[PDB]
Design a protein around this ligand. Structure first.
Ligand SMILES: O=S(=O)(c1cccc(C(F)(F)F)c1)N1CCc2ccc(OCc3c(Cl)cncc3Cl)cc21
Length: 259
């Protein structure tokens, strides 16, 4: 488009992200001294596997409801066909949740905010996927060395969400031009803010696909151990995005109709 239209894309996205944060930043920094206790950490460790899963899936789902709203406010996004809004969310909504987690992450004690207090990766030992849990801390630890601004996180998460080369898009170019316009707003704000140099420190694209692909691969395993915990206790939007078969009940386009 134009440089003046590019100037309010930054504004539009920075507003849509600030108005769609469950996690309010200043509330998280004012709680990193509220660190979990060995007696509470062991309490989480001694919880059954499926209960730490059911509790985290429910917490992931709550974090995706705010992403689907972020997407719903991304000007240009709801001008797209339902099949393309859902496919952008179905693949990029966990990726947005993972990049937003860098704010709930404290790199000094390598702790993450969880259920009202800050805990380490040892907190999630009962889940049985220690290798994947570690890579999410190592990933949030990597973005914490980028020292993101909330405006930077806004424009980076839209580009995580608005991906023109997702498999399954009906109309590809309508996203390419929404991606390319979003891509200028990010480079222009980084230019203005004297931050063009972080474009090379950003994680390689295939780093988020690998983290989401591990989560799907580790839900597969837990589904086999606890099948009826997924059908009975797991949230439907979780099963729709991640497990198969789970899109039998399409909660996604329910949220993309009401407004
Ligand atoms: O519960 S969070 O407040 C949470 C907060 C910090 C760290 C974690 C975890 F887990 F990364 F250390 C979890 N929340 C909000 C953001 C988020 C992302 C994924 C998630 O769960 C996915 C999952 C995994 Cl990665 C492994 N096994 C079962 C599941 Cl369902 C939960 C979640």
């Amino acid at each position: 488009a134009s440089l003046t239209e590019i100037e309010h894309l930054v504004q539009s996205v920075c507003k849509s992200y600030r108005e769609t944060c469950q996690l309010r930043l200043e509330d998280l920094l004012r709680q990193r001294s509220n660190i979990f206790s060995r007696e509470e950490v062991t309490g989480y460790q001694r919880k059954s596997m499926w209960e730490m899963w059911e509790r985290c899936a429910h917490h992931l789902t709550e974090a995706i409801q705010y992403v689907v709203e972020f997407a719903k406010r991304l000007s240009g996004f709801m001008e797209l066909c339902q099949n393309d809004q859902i496919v952008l969310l179905k693949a990029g909504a966990m990726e947005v949740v993972l990049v937003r987690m860098c704010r709930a992450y404290n790199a000094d004690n390598r702790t993450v905010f969880f259920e009202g207090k800050y805990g380490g990766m040892e907190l999630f030992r009962a889940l049985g996927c220690s290798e994947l849990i570690s890579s999410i801390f190592d990933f949030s630890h990597s973005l914490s060395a980028l020292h993101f601004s909330e405006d930077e996180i806004a424009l980076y998460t839209a580009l995580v969400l608005i991906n023109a080369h997702r498999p399954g898009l009906q109309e590809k170019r309508k996203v390419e031009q929404l991606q390319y316009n979003l891509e200028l707003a990010f480079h222009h704000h980084l230019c203005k803010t004297h931050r063009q140099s972080i474009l090379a420190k950003l994680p390689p694209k295939g780093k988020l696909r690998s983290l989401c692909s591990q989560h799907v691969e580790r839900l597969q395993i837990f589904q086999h151990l606890h099948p009826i915990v997924v059908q009975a206790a797991f949230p439907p939007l979780y099963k729709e995005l991640f497990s198969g078969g789970g899109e039998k009940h399409k909660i996604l386009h329910r949220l993309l109709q009401d407004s």
